[PDB]
C-alpha cells in the first residue's frame, strides 16, 4: 500500500532532507515524506 | 426552463424578445385593476372593450414577424 | 459597414471592433447606449482568464475598519511546544482575550465604497479616481510648497500639455482647494 512510483517532489525533498540531516538517520527522513518508509528512502538514496 | 414561457437563450431574436415583453405587459394590464382603469380613462372606452382590444393585440403585436 | 453604422447612433462611440459582427447591430447600437445601464466587463478577448498575480503580490494582506481598530482586539491576538500543547490541555488556562462586553456592545452601535455607475475590472486599482492636476501628499513634501504646484507656473508660459489636451489647471483657464490643483 505504501509502495509506489517515485515522484520528483518526493525525490527533491529527499535530496534536501539527506543534505540537512545526514546519511545515517533514515527514520527522520521518512518522517517528512508521505507514502514512503525508511528502508525505501535509504535504498532509494544508495 | 423551456416549458416556462418567456425563457430566452443565446439565439433569441429581437422580435421574439419584444413580443414577449409586450404580451407580459398586457397580462399585467389585465392584472392590475387600476392601471387598466387609467387606460379606460385616458382613451374613452369600457373596461371591457379595453380588455377586448388588448386580447386582440396579444398575438399580433409589432405585427408580422421577419 | 462599420463606417456608416456610426451615423445611426446618438453616441456612436459605443460601437467597437467586433460590434460590426453582431447578429443585430441595428439594436445593440440602441441598447449599449441606454441611459443608466453599465458596460460589459473587458476581461474577454484577453485570454488571460481574468487575473494574474503581478500587481496582486504587492498588496497588503488586509486592514481593518477604524471602528474595529479602536476596540483593542488587534493587540490581544498574536509559539508553543508540543508538550506545552498537551500541558495546555492538562493545565488549561481560561480567559486570555477577556474582552469588554460593554465595548463590543458599544462599537457596532454607538460608533457604527462606490455608486452604481462603477464596475470593477481586472487591473484597475488607483489610477482613474495621479493625474495632471492631482498628486500625492509626500511628493508635496519633497516639493515643499505650503497650502498652484509651481511647474503649473510654467504651464502658463509654454502652453497646455499636448499629452492631456482637455486639461484645466487652477488659476489659468481653471478658475482649487486642498491637494488637487487641476482637473
Amino acid at each position: 500500500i505504501k509502495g509506489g512510483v517515485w515522484r520528483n517532489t518526493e525525490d527533491e525533498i529527499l535530496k534536501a532532507a539527506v543534505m540537512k540531516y545526514g546519511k545515517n538517520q533514515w527514520s527522520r527522513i521518512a518522517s517528512l515524506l508521505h507514502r514512503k518508509s525508511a528502508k525505501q528512502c535509504k535504498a532509494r538514496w544508495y | 426552463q423551456s416549458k416556462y414561457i418567456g425563457t430566452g437563450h443565446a439565439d433569441t431574436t429581437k422580435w421574439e424578445w419584444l413580443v414577449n415583453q409586450h404580451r407580459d405587459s398586457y397580462c399585467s394590464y389585465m392584472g392590475h385593476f387600476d392601471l387598466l382603469n387609467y387606460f379606460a380613462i385616458a382613451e374613452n372606452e369600457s373596461k371591457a372593450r379595453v380588455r377586448f382590444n388588448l386580447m386582440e393585440k396579444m398575438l399580433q403585436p409589432c405585427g408580422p414577424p421577419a | 459597414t462599420v463606417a456608416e453604422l456610426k451615423q445611426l447612433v446618438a453616441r456612436p462611440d459605443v460601437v467597437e471592433m467586433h460590434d460590426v459582427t453582431a447578429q443585430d447591430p441595428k439594436l445593440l447600437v440602441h441598447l449599449k447606449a441606454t441611459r443608466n445601464s453599465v458596460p460589459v466587463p473587458r476581461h474577454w478577448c484577453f485570454k488571460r482568464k481574468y487575473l494574474q498575480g503581478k500587481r496582486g503580490i504587492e498588496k497588503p494582506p488586509f486592514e481593518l475598519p477604524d471602528f474595529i481598530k479602536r476596540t483593542g482586539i488587534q493587540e490581544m491576538r498574536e509559539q508553543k511546544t508540543m508538550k506545552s500543547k498537551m500541558r495546555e490541555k492538562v493545565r488549561p488556562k481560561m480567559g486570555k482575550i477577556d474582552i469588554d462586553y460593554q465595548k463590543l456592545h458599544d462599537a457596532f452601535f454607538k460608533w457604527q465604497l462606490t455608486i452604481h455607475g462603477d464596475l470593477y475590472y481586472e487591473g484597475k486599482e488607483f489610477e482613474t479616481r495621479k493625474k495632471p492636476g492631482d498628486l500625492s501628499d509626500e511628493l508635496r513634501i519633497s516639493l515643499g510648497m505650503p497650502v498652484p504646484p509651481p511647474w503649473l507656473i510654467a504651464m502658463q508660459r509654454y502652453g497646455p500639455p499636448p499629452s492631456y489636451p482637455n486639461l484645466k489647471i487652477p488659476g489659468l483657464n481653471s478658475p482649487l482647494y486642498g491637494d488637487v490643483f487641476g482637473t
Partner: protein, 332 residues
C-alpha cells in the same frame, strides 16, 4: 428618514361583486371587491339601506372573485382568485364578524403573470369542482367534497395544460350530477407566429372548447371544440337539467349566440341598436357583463352595452331544444 403610512378614505372603486348566502340566512349578503380590498355588505329587504358588515384589506391584488355552494348545501363559501400563486377558500363566520381562511392551496409563482393561474375563475353549479385558469397555458382544477362531518375538503389539483393557447374567459357549465363541463374560450397564436405574411393575423377564429372533468378517470380531457364565427368577449351559463336547457350564451361583436352541444344548432341574434344614434357607425358593440336571474318559476338574463343598455335575455325552447331567442329592451 422614515415614513409611517395611513389610509384615511378607503377606495370606493368596486371591481367585482358576488351575491351569496354567507350567514346561512334567507337574506343575501353581497361580497364586493374593492381594488386591493375585500368587502361585505348587507342590503335590507324593506328600506334597502346597504349596511357594511365588514371591510378588510388583503394586502394583495385581487384578480377574480366567485362564490359557490356545496350541492343542496345551506351556506356559501368564497373563492378568492389572487395575484399570488395560492387559491384560498374563505368562509364568513356570522358571529365573529370576520372571515376565516378555510383553504390555502399553492399552484405556482407570485404576482400577475402570463402563465400563472388565478386570472379567470369558474365553478360548477353543484360546487363539485372549481376550475381556476390563467390567461395562457395553465388551467387547473380543484375538486371539492365535504368531509365525513360535511365540512369542506379540497382535493389534489389536475392539469388542463394546452400549449400556446390564450383564454378569453372561463365559465362554469350546468350538468346536474354529471361529469362536469367547462366552457373555455381559447385562441391559438402559434398559427400567427409562424406566418410571416400576416395571414394568420386574420383568418384565425377563437376556438370554443368544452373540457370535461371526469371523476372516475380523475383527469381533465379535451372533449368539445367548435370554431367561433366571430370573437366574443365572454360566456354565460345556461342552467340545464331540470330547469332550462344546458348550454352557454356567447356575447360577440354585434351579436349574441346561444351555442351548445348535443344536436343543438347555434342560434344567433344581432345586438339591437337605438333609433337615430349620433355615434360613429364604425364603432360596434358588445356586452360588458351579465347577471343571471334564476327563479324556481322561470329564468332570464340581464345584459348591457357600452352605452348602458340592459336587455332581458330569454330562451324559446321546444322541450330541451331551443328554437329561437327573444330579447326585449329592459332598461338603462
Amino acid at each position: 428618514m422614515f415614513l409611517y403610512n395611513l389610509t384615511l378614505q378607503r377606495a370606493t372603486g368596486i371591481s367585482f361583486a358576488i351575491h351569496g348566502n354567507f350567514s346561512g340566512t334567507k337574506q343575501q349578503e353581497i361580497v364586493v371587491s374593492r381594488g386591493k380590498i375585500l368587502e361585505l355588505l348587507r342590503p335590507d329587504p324593506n328600506t334597502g339601506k346597504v349596511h357594511t358588515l365588514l371591510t378588510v384589506e388583503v394586502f394583495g391584488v385581487i384578480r377574480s372573485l366567485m362564490a359557490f355552494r356545496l350541492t343542496g348545501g345551506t351556506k356559501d363559501y368564497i373563492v378568492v382568485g389572487s395575484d399570488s400563486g395560492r387559491i384560498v377558500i374563505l368562509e364568513y363566520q356570522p358571529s365573529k364578524n370576520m372571515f376565516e381562511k378555510i383553504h390555502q392551496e399553492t399552484f405556482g409563482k407570485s404576482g400577475c403573470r402570463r402563465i400563472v393561474p388565478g386570472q379567470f375563475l369558474a365553478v360548477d353549479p353543484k360546487g363539485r369542482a372549481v376550475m381556476i385558469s390563467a390567461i395562457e397555458k395553465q388551467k387547473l382544477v380543484y375538486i371539492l367534497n365535504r368531509d365525513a362531518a360535511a365540512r369542506l375538503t379540497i382535493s389534489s389539483p389536475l392539469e388542463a395544460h394546452k400549449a400556446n393557447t390564450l383564454v378569453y374567459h372561463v365559465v362554469g357549465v350546468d350538468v346536474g350530477f354529471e361529469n362536469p363541463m367547462f366552457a373555455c374560450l381559447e385562441m391559438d397564436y402559434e398559427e400567427a407566429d409562424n406566418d410571416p405574411t400576416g395571414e394568420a393575423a386574420a383568418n384565425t377564429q377563437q376556438t370554443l372548447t368544452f373540457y370535461e372533468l371526469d371523476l372516475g378517470l380523475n383527469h381533465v380531457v379535451r372533449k368539445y371544440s367548435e370554431p367561433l364565427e366571430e370573437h366574443g368577449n365572454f360566456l354565460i351559463t345556461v342552467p340545464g337539467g331540470s330547469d332550462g336547457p344546458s348550454g352557454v350564451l356567447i356575447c360577440s361583436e354585434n351579436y349574441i349566440t346561444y351555442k351548445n352541444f348535443g344536436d343543438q344548432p347555434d342560434i344567433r341574434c344581432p345586438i339591437p341598436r337605438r333609433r337615430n344614434d349620433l355615434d360613429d357607425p364604425e364603432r360596434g358593440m358588445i356586452f360588458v357583463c351579465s347577471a343571471t336571474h334564476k327563479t324556481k318559476s322561470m329564468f332570464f338574463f340581464l345584459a348591457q352595452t357600452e352605452q348602458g343598455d340592459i336587455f332581458k335575455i330569454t330562451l324559446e325552447t321546444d322541450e330541451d331544444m331551443v328554437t329561437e331567442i327573444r330579447l326585449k329592451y329592459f332598461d338603462t
